[PDB]
Short mmCIF file of C-alpha atoms in Angstrom, two decimals:
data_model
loop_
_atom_site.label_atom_id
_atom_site.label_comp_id
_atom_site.label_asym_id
_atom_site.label_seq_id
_atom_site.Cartn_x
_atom_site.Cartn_y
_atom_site.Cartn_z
CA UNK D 1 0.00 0.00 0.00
CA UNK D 2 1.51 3.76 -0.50
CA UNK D 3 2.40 4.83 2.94
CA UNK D 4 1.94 8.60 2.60
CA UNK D 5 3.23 8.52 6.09
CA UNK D 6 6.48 7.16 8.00
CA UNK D 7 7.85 6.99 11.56
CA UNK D 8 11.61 7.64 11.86
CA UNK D 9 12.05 7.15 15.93
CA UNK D 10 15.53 8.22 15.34
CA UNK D 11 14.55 12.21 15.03
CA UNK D 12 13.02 11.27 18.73
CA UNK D 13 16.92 12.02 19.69
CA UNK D 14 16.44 15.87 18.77
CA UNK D 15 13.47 15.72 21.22
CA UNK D 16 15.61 13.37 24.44
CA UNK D 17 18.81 15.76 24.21
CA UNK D 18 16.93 18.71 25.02
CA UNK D 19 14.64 16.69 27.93
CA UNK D 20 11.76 17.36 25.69
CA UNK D 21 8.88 15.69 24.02
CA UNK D 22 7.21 16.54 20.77
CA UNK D 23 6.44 15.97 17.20
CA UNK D 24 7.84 16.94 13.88
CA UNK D 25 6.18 16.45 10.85
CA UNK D 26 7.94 16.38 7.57
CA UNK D 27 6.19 16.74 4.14
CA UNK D 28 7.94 16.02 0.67
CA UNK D 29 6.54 17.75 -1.50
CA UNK D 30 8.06 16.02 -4.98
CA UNK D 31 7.35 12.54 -3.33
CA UNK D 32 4.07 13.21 -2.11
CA UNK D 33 5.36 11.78 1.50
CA UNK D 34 5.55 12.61 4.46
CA UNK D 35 7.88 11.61 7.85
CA UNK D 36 7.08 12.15 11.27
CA UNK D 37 9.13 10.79 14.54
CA UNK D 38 5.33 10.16 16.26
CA UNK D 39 2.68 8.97 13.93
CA UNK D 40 -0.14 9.51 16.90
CA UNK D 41 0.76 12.82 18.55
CA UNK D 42 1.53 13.62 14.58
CA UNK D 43 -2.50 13.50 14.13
CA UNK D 44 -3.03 14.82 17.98
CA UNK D 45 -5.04 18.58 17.78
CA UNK D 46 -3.87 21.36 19.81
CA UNK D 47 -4.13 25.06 20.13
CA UNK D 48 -2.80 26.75 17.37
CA UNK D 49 -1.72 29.82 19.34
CA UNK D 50 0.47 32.33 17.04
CA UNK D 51 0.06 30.05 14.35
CA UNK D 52 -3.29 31.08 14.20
CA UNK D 53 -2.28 34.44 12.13
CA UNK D 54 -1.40 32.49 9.26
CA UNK D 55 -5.17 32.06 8.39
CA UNK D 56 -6.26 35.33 10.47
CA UNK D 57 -3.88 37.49 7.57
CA UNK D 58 -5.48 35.95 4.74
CA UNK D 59 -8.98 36.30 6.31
CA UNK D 60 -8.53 40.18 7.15
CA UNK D 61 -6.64 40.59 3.97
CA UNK D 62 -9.29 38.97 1.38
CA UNK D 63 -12.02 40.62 3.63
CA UNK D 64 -10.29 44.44 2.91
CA UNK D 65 -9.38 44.83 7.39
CA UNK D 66 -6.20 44.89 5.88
CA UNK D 67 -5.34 46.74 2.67
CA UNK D 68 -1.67 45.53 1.46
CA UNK D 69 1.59 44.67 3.52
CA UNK D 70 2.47 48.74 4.63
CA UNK D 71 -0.89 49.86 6.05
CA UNK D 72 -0.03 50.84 9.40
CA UNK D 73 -2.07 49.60 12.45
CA UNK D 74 -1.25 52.48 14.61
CA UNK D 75 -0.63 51.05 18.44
CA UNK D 76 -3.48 51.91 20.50
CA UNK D 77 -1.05 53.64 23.30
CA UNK D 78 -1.87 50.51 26.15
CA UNK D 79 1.89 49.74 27.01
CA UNK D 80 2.18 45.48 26.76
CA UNK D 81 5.12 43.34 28.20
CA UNK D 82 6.28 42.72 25.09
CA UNK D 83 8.04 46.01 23.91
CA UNK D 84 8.33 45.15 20.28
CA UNK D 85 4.12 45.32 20.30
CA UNK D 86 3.95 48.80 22.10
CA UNK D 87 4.31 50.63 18.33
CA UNK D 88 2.73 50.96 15.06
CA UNK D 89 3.07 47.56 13.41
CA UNK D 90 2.37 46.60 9.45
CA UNK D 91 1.26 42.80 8.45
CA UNK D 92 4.86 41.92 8.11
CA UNK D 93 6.16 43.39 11.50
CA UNK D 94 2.96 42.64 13.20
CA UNK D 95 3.89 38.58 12.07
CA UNK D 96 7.39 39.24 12.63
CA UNK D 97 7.02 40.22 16.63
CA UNK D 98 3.95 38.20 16.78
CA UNK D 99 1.61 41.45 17.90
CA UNK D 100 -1.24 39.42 19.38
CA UNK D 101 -3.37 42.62 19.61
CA UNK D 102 -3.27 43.45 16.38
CA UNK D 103 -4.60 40.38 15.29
CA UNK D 104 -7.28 40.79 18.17
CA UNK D 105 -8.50 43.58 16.31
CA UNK D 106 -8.33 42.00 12.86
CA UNK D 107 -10.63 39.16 14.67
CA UNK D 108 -12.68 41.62 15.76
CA UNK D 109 -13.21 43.16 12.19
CA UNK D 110 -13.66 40.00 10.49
CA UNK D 111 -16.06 38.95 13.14
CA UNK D 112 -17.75 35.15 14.80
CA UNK D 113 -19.63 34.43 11.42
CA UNK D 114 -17.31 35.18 8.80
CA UNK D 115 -14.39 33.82 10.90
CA UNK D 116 -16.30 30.53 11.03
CA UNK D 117 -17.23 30.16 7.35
CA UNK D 118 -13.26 31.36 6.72
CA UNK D 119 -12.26 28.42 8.74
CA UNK D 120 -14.64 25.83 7.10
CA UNK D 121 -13.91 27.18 3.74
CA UNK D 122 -10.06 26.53 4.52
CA UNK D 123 -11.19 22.92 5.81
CA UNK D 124 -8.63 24.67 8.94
CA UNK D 125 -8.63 21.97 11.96
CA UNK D 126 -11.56 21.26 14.17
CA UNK D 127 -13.05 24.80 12.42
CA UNK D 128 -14.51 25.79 15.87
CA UNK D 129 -14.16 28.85 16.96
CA UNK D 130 -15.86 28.66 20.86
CA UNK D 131 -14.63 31.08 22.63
CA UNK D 132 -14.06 35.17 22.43
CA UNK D 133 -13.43 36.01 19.03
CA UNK D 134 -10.09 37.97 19.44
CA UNK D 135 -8.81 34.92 21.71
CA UNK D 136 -10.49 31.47 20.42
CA UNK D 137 -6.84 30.70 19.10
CA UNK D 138 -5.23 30.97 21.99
CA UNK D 139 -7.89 29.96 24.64
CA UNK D 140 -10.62 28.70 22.60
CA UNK D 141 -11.84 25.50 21.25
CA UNK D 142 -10.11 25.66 18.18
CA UNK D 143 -7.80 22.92 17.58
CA UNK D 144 -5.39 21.38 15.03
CA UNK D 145 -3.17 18.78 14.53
CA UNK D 146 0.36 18.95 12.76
CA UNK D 147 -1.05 17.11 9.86
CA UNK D 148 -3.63 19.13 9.28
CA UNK D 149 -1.33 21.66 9.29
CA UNK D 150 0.66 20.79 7.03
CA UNK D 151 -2.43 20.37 4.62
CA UNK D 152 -3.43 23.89 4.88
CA UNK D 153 -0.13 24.95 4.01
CA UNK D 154 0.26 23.14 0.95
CA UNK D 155 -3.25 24.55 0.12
CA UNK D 156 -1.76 28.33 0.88
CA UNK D 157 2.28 27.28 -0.97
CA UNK D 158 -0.13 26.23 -3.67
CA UNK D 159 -2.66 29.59 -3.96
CA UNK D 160 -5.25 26.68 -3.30
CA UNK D 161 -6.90 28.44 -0.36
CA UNK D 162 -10.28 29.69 -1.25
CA UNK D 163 -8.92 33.48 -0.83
CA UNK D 164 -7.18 35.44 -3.54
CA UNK D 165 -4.02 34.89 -4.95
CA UNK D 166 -3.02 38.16 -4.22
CA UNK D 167 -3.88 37.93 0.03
CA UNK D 168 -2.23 33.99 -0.43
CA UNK D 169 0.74 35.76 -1.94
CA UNK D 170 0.64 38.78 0.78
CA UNK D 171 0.91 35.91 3.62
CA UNK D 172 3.81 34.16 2.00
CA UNK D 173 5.50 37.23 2.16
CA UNK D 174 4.64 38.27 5.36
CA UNK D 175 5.61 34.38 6.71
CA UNK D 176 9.19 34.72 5.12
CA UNK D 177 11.93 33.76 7.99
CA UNK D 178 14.61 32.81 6.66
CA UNK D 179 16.41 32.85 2.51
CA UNK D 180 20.07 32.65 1.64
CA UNK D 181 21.70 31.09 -0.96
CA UNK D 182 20.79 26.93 -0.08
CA UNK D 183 16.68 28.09 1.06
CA UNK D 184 13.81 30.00 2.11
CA UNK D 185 12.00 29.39 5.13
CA UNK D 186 8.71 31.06 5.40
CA UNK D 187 6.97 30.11 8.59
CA UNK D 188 5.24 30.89 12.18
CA UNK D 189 5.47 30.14 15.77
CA UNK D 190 3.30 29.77 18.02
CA UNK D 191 2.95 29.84 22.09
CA UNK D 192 0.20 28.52 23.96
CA UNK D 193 0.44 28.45 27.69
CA UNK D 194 -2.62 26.12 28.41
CA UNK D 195 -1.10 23.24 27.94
CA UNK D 196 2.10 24.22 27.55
CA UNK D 197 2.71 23.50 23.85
CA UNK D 198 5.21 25.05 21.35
CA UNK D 199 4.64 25.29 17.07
CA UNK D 200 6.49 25.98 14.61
CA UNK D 201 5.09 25.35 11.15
CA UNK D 202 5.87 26.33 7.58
CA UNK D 203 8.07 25.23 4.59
CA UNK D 204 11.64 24.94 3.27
CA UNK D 205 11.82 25.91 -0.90
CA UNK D 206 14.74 24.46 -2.30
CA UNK D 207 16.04 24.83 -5.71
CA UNK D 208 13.67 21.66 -6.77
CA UNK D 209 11.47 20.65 -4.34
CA UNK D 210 9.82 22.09 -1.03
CA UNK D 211 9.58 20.57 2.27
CA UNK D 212 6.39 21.12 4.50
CA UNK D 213 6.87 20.92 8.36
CA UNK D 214 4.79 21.11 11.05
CA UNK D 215 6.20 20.50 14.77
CA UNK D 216 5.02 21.31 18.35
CA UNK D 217 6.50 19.84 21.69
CA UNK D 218 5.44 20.39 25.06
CA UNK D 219 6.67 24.03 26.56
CA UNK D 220 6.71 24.16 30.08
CA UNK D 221 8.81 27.51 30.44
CA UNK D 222 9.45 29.85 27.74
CA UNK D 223 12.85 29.17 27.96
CA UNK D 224 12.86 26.39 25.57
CA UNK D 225 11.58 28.58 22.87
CA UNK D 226 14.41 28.50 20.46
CA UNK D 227 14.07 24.54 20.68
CA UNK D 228 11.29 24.95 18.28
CA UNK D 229 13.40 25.98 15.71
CA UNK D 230 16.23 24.29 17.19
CA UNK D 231 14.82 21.17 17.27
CA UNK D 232 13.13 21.29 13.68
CA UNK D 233 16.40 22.36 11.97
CA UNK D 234 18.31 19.47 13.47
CA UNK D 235 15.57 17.12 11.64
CA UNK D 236 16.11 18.82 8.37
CA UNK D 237 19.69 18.73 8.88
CA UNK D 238 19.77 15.20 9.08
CA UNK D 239 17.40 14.39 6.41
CA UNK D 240 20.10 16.65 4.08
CA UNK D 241 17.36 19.13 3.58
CA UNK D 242 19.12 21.93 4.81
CA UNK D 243 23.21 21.93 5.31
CA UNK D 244 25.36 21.88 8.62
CA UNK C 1 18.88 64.99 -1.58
CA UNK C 2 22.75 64.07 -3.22
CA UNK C 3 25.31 63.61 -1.00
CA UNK C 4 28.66 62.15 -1.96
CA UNK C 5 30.36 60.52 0.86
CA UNK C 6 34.08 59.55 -0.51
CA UNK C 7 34.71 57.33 2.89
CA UNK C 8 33.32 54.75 0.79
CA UNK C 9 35.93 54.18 -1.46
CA UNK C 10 38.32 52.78 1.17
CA UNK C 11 35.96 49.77 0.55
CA UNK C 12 36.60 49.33 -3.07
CA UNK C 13 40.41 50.16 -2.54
CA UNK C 14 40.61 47.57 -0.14
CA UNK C 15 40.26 45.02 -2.66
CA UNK C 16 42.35 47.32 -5.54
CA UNK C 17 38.93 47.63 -7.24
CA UNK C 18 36.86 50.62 -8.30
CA UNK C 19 33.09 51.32 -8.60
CA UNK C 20 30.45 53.29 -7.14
CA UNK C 21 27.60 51.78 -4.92
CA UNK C 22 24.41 54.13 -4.75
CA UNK C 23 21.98 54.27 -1.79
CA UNK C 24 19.11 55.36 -1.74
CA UNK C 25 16.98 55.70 1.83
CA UNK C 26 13.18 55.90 1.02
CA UNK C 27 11.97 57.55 4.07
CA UNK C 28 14.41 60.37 3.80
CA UNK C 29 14.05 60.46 0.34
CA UNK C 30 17.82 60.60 0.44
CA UNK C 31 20.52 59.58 -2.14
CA UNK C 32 24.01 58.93 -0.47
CA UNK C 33 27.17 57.98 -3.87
CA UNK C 34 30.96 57.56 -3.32
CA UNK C 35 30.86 58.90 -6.76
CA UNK C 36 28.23 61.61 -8.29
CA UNK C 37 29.38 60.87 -11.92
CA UNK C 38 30.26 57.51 -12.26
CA UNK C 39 26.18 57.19 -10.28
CA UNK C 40 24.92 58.16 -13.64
CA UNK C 41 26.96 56.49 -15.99
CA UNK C 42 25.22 53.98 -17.88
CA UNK C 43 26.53 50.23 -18.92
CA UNK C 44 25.00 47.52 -20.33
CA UNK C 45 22.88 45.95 -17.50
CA UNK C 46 23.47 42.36 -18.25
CA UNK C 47 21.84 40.12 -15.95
CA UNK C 48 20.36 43.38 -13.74
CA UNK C 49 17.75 43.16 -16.86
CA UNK C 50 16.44 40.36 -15.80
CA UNK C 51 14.36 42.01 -13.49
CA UNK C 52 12.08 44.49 -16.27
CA UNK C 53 13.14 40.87 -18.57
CA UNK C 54 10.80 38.94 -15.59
CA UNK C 55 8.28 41.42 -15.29
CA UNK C 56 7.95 41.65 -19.01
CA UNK C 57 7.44 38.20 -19.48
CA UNK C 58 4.86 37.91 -16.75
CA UNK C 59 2.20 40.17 -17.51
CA UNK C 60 2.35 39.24 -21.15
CA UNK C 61 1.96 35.44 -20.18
CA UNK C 62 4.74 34.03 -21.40
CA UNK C 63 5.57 33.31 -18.04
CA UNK C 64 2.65 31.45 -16.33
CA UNK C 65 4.16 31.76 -12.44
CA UNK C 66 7.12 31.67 -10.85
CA UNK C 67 6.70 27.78 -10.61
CA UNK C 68 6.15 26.81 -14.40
CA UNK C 69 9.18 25.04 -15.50
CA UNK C 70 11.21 26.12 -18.77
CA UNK C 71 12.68 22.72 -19.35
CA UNK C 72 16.55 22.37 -20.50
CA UNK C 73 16.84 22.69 -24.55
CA UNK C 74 19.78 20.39 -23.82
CA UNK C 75 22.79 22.54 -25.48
CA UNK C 76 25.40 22.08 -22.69
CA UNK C 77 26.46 25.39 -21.12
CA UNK C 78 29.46 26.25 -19.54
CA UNK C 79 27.62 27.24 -16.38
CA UNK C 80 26.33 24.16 -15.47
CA UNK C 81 23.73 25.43 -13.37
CA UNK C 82 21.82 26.57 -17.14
CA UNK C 83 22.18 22.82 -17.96
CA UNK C 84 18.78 21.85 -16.52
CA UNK C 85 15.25 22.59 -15.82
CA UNK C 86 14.33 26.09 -14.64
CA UNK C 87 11.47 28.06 -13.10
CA UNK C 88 11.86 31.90 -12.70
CA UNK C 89 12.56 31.77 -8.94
CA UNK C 90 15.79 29.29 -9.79
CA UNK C 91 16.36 30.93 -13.63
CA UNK C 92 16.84 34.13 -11.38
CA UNK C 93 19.14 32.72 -8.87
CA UNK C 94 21.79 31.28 -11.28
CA UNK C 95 21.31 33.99 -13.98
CA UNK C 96 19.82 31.77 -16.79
CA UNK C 97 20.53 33.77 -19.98
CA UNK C 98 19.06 30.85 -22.09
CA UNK C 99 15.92 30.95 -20.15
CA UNK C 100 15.63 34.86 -20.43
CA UNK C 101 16.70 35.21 -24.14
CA UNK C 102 13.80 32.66 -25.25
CA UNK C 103 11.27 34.97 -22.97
CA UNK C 104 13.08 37.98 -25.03
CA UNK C 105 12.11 36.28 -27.93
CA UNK C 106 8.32 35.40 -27.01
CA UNK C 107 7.97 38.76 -25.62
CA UNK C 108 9.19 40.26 -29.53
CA UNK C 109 10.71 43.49 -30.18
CA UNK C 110 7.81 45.72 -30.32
CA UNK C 111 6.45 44.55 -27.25
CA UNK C 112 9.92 44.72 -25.60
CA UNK C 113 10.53 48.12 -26.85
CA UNK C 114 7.01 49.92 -25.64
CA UNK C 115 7.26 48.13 -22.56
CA UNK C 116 10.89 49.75 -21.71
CA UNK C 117 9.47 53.33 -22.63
CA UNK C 118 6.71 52.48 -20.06
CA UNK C 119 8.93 51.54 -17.56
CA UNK C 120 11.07 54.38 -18.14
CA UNK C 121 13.90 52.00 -18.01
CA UNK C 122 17.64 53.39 -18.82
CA UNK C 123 17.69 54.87 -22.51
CA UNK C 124 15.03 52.26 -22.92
CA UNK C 125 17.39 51.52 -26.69
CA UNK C 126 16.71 47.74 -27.60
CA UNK C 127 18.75 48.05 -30.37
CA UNK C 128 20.53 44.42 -31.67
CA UNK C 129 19.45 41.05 -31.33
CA UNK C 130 16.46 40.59 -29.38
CA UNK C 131 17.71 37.90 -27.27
CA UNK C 132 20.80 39.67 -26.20
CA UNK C 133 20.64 43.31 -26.90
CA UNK C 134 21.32 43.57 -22.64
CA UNK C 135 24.47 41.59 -23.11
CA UNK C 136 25.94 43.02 -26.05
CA UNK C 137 22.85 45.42 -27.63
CA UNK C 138 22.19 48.83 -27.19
CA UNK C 139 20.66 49.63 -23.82
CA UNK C 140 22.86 51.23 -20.91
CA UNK C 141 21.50 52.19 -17.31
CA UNK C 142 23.38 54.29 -14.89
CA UNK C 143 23.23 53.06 -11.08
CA UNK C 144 20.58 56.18 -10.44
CA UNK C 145 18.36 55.07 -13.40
CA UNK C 146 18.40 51.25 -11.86
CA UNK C 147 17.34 53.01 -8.29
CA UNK C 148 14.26 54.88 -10.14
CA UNK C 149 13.22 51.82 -11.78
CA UNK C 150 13.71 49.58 -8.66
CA UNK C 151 11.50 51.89 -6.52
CA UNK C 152 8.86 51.92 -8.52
CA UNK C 153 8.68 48.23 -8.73
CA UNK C 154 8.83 48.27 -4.81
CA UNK C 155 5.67 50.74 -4.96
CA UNK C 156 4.37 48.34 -7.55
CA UNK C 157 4.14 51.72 -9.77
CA UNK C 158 5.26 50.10 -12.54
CA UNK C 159 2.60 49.65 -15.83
CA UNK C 160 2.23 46.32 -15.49
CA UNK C 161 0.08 44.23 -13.31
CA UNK C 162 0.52 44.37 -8.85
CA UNK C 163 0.75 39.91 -9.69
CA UNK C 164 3.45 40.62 -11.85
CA UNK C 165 5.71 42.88 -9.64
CA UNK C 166 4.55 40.36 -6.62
CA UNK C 167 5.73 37.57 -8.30
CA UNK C 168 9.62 39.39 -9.87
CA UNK C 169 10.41 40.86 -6.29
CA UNK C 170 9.27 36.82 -4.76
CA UNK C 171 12.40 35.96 -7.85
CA UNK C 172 14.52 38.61 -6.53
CA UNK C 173 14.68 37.71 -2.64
CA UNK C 174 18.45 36.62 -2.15
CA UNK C 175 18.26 37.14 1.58
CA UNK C 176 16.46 37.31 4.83
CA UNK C 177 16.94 36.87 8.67
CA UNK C 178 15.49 38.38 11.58
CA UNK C 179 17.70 41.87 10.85
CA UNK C 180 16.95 42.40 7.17
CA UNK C 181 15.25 41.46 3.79
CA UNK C 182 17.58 41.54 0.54
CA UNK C 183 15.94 41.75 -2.76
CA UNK C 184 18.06 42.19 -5.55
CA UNK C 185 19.86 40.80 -8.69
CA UNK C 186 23.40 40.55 -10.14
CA UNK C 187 25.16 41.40 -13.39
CA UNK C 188 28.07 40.97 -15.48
CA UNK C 189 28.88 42.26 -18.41
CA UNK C 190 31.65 41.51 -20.24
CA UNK C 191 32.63 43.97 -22.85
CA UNK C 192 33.50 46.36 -20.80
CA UNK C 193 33.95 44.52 -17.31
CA UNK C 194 31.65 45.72 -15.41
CA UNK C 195 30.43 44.10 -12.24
CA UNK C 196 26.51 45.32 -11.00
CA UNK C 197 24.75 44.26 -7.87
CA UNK C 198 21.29 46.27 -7.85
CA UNK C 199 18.05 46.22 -5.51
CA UNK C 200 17.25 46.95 -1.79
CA UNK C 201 17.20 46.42 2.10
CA UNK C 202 14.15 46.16 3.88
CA UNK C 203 13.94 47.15 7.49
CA UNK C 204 10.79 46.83 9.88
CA UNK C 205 10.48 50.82 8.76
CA UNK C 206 12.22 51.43 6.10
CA UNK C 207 13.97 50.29 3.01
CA UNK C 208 17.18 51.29 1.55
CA UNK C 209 17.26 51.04 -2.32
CA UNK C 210 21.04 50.37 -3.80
CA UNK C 211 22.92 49.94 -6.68
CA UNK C 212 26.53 49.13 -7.26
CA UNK C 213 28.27 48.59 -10.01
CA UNK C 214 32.54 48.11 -10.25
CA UNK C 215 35.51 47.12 -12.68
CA UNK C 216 35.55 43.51 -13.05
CA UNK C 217 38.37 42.69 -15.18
CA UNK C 218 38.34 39.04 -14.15
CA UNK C 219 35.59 36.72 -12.66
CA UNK C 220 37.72 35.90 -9.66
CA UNK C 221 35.99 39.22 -7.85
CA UNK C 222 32.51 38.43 -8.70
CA UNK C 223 31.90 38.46 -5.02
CA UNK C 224 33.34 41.93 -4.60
CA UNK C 225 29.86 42.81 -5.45
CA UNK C 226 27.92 41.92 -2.11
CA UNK C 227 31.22 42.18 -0.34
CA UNK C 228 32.05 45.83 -1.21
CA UNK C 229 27.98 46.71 -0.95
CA UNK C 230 27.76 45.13 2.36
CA UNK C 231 30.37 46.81 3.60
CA UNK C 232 29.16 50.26 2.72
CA UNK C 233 25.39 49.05 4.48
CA UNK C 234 27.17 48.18 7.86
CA UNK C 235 29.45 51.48 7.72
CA UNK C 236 25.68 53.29 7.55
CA UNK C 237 24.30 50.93 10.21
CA UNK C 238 21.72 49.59 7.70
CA UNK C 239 22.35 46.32 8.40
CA UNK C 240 24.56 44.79 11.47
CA UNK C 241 28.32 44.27 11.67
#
């Protein structure tokens, strides 16, 4: 039978030298396969925190609460922990820092009803949005699993999402990490701190093929936030999809 | 709005080279030149014209997206990179003149000229063969005519569709880390040497539009280009040491 998906334990390694416990999920693009160290927390749901504003951008952009990529969403003056958020933010800086109020107020514009349709027309996880409706992604009952993830990306790498081009393209842009001369990363965190449970999700474009990935692990303090990325890039490192 | 700030060429003497890099900072509407004249003179663009070249192509459909792949025509190249399949994200990267001068040739001369003239683009001359009057032909662009050009295509000012400049400045991204975005595209022309690296540097608020272009009488100092540019962006604390 074609096993779209494979367990390599070995990548569980990544997760024992830092104490931690997680998932990553690994999609080839070219091969139409994918590769995950934990088959069952691979298809587990969870918050999808700051990865949330993946979908949230290309809702508020196809729905005109946000113009292009410079319109400025002025800072409303309350002073946050976070200093990066206590300014005027665009989409690109607002992804960047992760400004969870500006999305709040996207949420707000776009609204319970047309959120919810958004979500079902993206077939996005569970596609519930219980909760308050600048918050349901971080405290809500949506929920989504790494796989899924990883579907609605290819849908968005692929302009598949049932948005325009143009806000699919905007995102992309907005989600770009990392690019040098071996890749581009475009991709997006996310926190939640009930449970404790990191993300990081996006792609790798190579010359000839791109990789989808999807990981989260669990997050007890924040200082394990860099294993995220840490943890993810030693995965892609051994599978030779990125160098040493 | 000129300034000339000679400091700069301890960066090209360094390396026994000489050139002029061109910066341009777009909220202080600003222009900053180790060198006012040799900022406006104009050389062939070579592979710098792949950028209008892209756009071009784009909004006339010859090029679908920047995924469609332009297969090999299997004449072997001495850059092997040309000798395989291309899309316009990788035909950018490794400076695919094969890929380009078949574009050049769907797009036609007619179309090619008018489309120059509306993109105001050097002394928007075509003049030569079709598929190579960039490389050997008649059109020339000073440094400050690439900058003009460059920020309208940022603004997506140019006459051609918002997809189309979307898609060319995706092509263009060379690099990106939490500090800085780099857009931009080399060049090298051979006849005379010149060496060209032209785009910008985007900041959380602000971007800094440059242009560089230097004697390159061999290939060994083809990465004098970044090198030499860099240097000038971290003496103006654009970008980190």
């Amino acid at each position: 039978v074609a096993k779209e998906w494979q367990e390599n334990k070995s990548w569980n390694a990544h997760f024992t030298e830092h104490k931690s416990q997680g998932v990553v999920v690994l999609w080839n693009e070219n091969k139409q396969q994918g590769f995950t160290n934990n088959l069952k927390r691979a298809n587990q749901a969870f918050l999808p925190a700051s990865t949330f504003k993946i979908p949230n951008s290309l809702i508020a952009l196809d729905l005109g609460v946000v113009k292009d990529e410079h319109q400025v969403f002025k800072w409303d003056g309350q002073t946050r922990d976070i200093a990066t958020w206590n300014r005027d933010h665009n989409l690109i800086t607002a992804m960047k820092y992760s400004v969870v109020p500006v999305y709040q107020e996207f949420a707000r514009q776009i609204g319970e009803a047309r959120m919810s349709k958004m979500l079902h027309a993206f077939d996005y996880g569970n596609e519930d949005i219980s909760g308050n409706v600048d918050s349901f992604w971080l405290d809500g009952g949506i929920r989504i699993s790494a796989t899924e993830q990883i579907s609605f990306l290819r849908k968005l790498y692929h302009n598949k999402l049932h948005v325009s081009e143009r806000s699919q393209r905007i995102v992309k842009q907005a989600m770009l990490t990392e690019a040098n001369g071996d890749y581009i990363i475009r991709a997006k965190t996310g926190y939640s701190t009930k449970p404790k449970i990191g993300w990081w999700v996006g792609w790798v474009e190579l010359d000839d093929n791109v990789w989808f990935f999807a990981m989260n692990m669990d997050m007890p303090t924040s200082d394990g936030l860099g294993l995220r990325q840490a943890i993810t890039k030693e995965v892609l490192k051994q599978e030779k999809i990125i160098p040493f």
